[PDB]
């Protein structure tokens, strides 16, 4: 189920038992669905015979390599099974060890005999602002079951067990995303794509020539300047951590679902790391930082192709403008991505992105990213009010 009213056909045997609003129901209230638990299941849920829980120590390079391999071979693919996410091992450290990360929230499943990693789910702590409430939550990501273990209800036990391990730490709400419709999205956002190397994109069938266009026409149309234009643009540095935190916090106040980041969290999520996260700040003639752009690195494997093996994609992160126009800022984001060797630059239609997507020659995608809250009943919102980007 990837669209809304084909989700209406479905019954949800697992999600009907969970504290989430029903797919069809109108929500006019704001708050938890069930009470905070004052007694929590002490024992892990039972796994089918021959498998065992195992908290992964990602500080161990071999176990981290095992996690890379699990996701590299079994994680999300497109709607035609032509591309698959290729999260790098050091990207995984970035996404999975932010301030406050806990080792029991890196929840793997192993075969008892071979010790092979065949399942995974993760939680990281996050303070979330939703309408007029700030709640400490977790973000759930990287739910993955090995292809040879699918359709055996391993994913529901993974969800229940990470729920249990989060409950034990006193947290009773969570936020997550998924490309499918479930009960019940608090918001729906659409991916958009800006070709950077249109010939590679067309060759590997990521893109297609538009109506009555040719490869030569397309390459010209998508050409970009070779250097950015915005005055004072430079990579973010340690000295920028306070102003970037200040800039982000105040800009996010206009949306209805946002992170509430500490300054330590701002450092983690934005301080540039090569091939993971790029952040560029605008420092004006006064020495003041007034804007910043950021995008993270998420390549994908190209399946079944003899010469092209990988597609290097950039994902728009958080972009704050207070004196540079957002159109100009994102234009330079495209140029920096091109320079850094990306083949495509992706962005969702959330926050104010719809004001530059069409004008910068983004093409609308076939994928929706649905946003979800666990144990929090509230009215849904349009994508322009979503102010939260996950990995």
């Amino acid at each position: 189920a990837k669209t809304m009213e084909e989700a209406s056909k479905r019954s949800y045997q697992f999600w009907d038992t969970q504290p989430v609003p029903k797919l069809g129901e109108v929500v006019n209230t704001h708050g938890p669905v069930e009470p905070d638990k004052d007694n929590i299941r002490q024992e892990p849920y039972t796994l089918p015979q021959g498998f065992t829980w195992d908290a992964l120590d990602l500080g161990d390079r071999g176990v981290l390599k095992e996690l890379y391999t699990l996701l590299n071979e079994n994680y999300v693919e497109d709607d035609d099974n032509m591309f698959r996410f290729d999260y790098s091992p050091e990207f995984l450290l970035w996404a999975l060890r932010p301030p406050g990360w806990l080792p029991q929230w890196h929840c793997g499943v192993r075969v008892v005999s071979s010790r092979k990693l065949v399942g995974f789910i993760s939680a990281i702590p996050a303070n979330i602002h939703i309408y007029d409430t700030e709640k400490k939550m977790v973000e759930i990501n990287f739910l993955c079951v090995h292809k040879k273990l699918r359709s055996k209800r391993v994913a529901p036990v993974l969800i229940r067990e990470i729920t249990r391990r989060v409950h034990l730490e006193g947290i009773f709400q969570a936020v997550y995303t998924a490309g499918v419709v479930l009960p019940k999205p608090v918001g729906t956002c659409r991916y958009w794509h800006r070709s950077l190397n249109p010939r590679k994109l067309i060759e590997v069938k990521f893109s297609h020539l538009s109506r009555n266009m040719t490869m030569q026409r397309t390459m010209k149309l998508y050409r970009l300047p070779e250097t950015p234009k915005t005055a004072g643009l430079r990579p973010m540095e340690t000295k920028d951590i306070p102003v970037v935190h200040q800039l982000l916090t105040r800009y996010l106040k206009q949306f209805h679902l946002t992170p509430v980041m500490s300054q330590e969290e701002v450092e983690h999520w934005f301080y540039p790391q090569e091939n993971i996260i790029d952040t560029f700040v605008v420092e004006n003639a006064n020495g003041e930082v007034t804007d910043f752009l950021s995008f993270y690195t998420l390549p994908s494997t190209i399946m079944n192709h003899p010469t092209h093996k990988s597609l290097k994609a950039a994902y728009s992160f958080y972009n704050v403008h207070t004196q540079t126009p957002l159109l100009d800022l994102m234009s330079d984001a495209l140029v920096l991505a091109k320079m850094k060797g990306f083949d495509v630059f992706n962005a969702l239609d959330l926050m104010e992105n719809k004001t530059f997507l069409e004008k910068l020659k983004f093409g609308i995608g076939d994928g929706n990213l649905q946003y979800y809250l666990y144990n929090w009943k509230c009215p849904s919102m349009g994508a322009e009010k979503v102010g939260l980007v996950l990995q």
């Binding site: 591309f83 698959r84 990521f206 893109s207 076939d366």
Partner: peptide
Amino acid sequence: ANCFSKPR
């Protein structure tokens, strides 16, 4: 999970 999209 994040989701993989491509131009429609």
